[PDB]
Symmetry: D2
Subunit: 203 residues, 4 copies
């Protein structure tokens, strides 16, 4: 709850080379995610009555929040939640293909990992402007591939995110420039499916 | 859960005269609410996996529903939920002013019943086209006055409805025609605050 | 331009019996349309620099209007324009089927009157809540059938309206109650296609 | 009209150093804008009846375009028009402050260049995600400062663009990383106000 904290990456900024550059990892965590946490805190400071609430609860009830902080919480709260999930998913050393219960769900609803990789790529490439591509779970057991604009998080619509891929240009511009496709091809080498499995099971 | 049922009014169609006419009460319940229940059921028939879900759960996760029934559930599910709350709120013989815990909340957040009546009237009058005016509760204890378009229900945004007022023209046209203001003046004579208190407490 | 005036209806309130009742014609014209004109004028009253502009132009440039009157102009200016067209299209004494240049376009593009009636009926029935169904022309010479919510007029999006059918409940509730389909069957008996032809030629 | 062409940039990629880096100018023009032109042409290729229309007209009539190409035209046609204006406004050798008729309008309406810089800076900084900040004119002779998301161009809403500043991360990431504010301070050093003056006169 408030005051929110910037989580440590938990690994060196250079750990994902040559897939994502150390310079991006550092700026992406310290400057972009850092700003989101600071701004989120700045917006909630004025309202003591909301200090005991988890960010996910704030995002599901955005319409209830005072009108002067709705946008600030959506943007920075979403920014904080998305990136926190992202750092965890990039943790080095985990399985490079789906495993466990998430694997079963994937093979059963999409056909196999190759089919899911095509849908998520199609979703990430298709998101015009800034946004995230996601594999989400709904309360009825169904998996969905979708994209959201800017820092919007699927929890706002009642989904539970399992995998999220950051497609804002700041995520890949320094190393890939306009080549978002090459950035997505590299992301598959670094996603930690054991972490995705933890997210799916708690889901 | 599915198959949904049209609830009985629980009172004679003529019980609210001369405030709302018996002919409207009958058409409003049998034809309008009846159609919503039928259409809601028609849309869910194709998806066995959703047959054990309460309408409120369906409405909070609209984005998860198959794309071919999202609109049908929003419109008819919302229509079913709104009118079901409405018939209960019009039950004859209850308190004509807020009472109990809802009263305390009202006097504390709005100043008193007269101030709440001005905000809800302003909200009902201000809803252009079809819609509902509502007194809702959020998870943080705050009361809000808002209006929604068509058959949208505040649960879609994470609120719990306490009082809802139907401002579609079919609710007042036969007796009041274009005079929505006169219809709202009459509604205060028939709202059951003991029922509103039941809704608030379970909220 | 400003000050806007209620147009004459042009024929006796009872001219369209038994298809549309006299009472509806009186209230629809004097009370509903009378209210839109009054409210539009009140909005524009505080902005002299907008006094010599036709309503079509204001609607095409809603985003440019002062912030405090954009909704008022969209809703009331749209209401004024929509009903002004409607009274003319209902003028007694014209062709009951498409004629002339509009007929050639309909035959070519939709296959004939029968196909268009069907499409226009589907658009009217499918407009949930308050709204209008339209046959419009775009700058490229193509015809489209679409519906708009509340009092939105298709000029807002660049189209030129040819035929508009009011589907707000006030347009049919006194005579038809919930039976919007019976109202639509009856409307074909009163449309004036010689008027539709002028709208088509002129744009 | 179709086929659309990539406009010449007009000056060496390094002409705007040290304010905008040469590498950004090359990629922005050849790769980003080159992609928008290619994608726009591919969309319009299957619709000959739209071949002699200027891009401004297509954007004003998006709702009239075939359903399957509306997004493609909005995004790529908007991208083509936005950047075409941008290259011209960055032409070396013009006035660094407003001049002529546009200067009189700015002085009258905003109080002077200083006040406008401030307003334009606020709009650019406040555009969350991808977008553009603009100084536009409406048909009524008034100037507005606003921002649009992604590649939306203000002609979609009836405005005539005078000054547009690209705030997508690709416009500033190689040199400035997250520091959008430093990029905006630098942009004032390269804007060409003689060009802005022509855009203003011409509309
Ligand atoms: Mn990011
Ligand atoms: Mn109703
Ligand atoms: Mn009407
Ligand atoms: Mn750009």
């Amino acid at each position: 709850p408030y005051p929110f904290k910037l989580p440590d990456l938990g690994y060196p900024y250079e750990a994902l080379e040559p897939h994502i550059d150390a310079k991006t990892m550092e700026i992406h965590h310290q400057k972009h995610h850092g700003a989101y946490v600071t701004n989120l805190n700045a917006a909630l400071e004025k309202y003591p009555y909301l200090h005991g609430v988890e960010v996910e609860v704030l995002l599901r009830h955005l319409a209830a929040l005072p009108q002067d902080i709705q946008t600030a919480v959506r943007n920075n709260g979403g920014g904080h939640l998305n990136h926190s999930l992202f750092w965890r998913l990039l943790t080095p050393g985990g399985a490079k293909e789906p495993v466990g219960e998430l694997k079963k769900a994937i093979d059963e609803q999409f056909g196999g990992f190759q089919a899911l990789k095509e849908k998520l790529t199609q979703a990430a490439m298709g998101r015009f402007g800034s946004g995230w591509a996601w594999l989400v779970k709904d309360p009825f057991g169904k998996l969905h591939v979708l994209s959201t604009p800017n820092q919007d998080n699927p929890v706002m619509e009642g989904f539970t995110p399992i995998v999220g891929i950051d497609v804002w240009e700041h995520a890949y511009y320094l190393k890939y420039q306009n080549r978002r496709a090459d950035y997505l091809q590299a992301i598959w080498n670094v996603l930690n499916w054991d972490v995705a499995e933890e997210f799916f099971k708690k889901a």
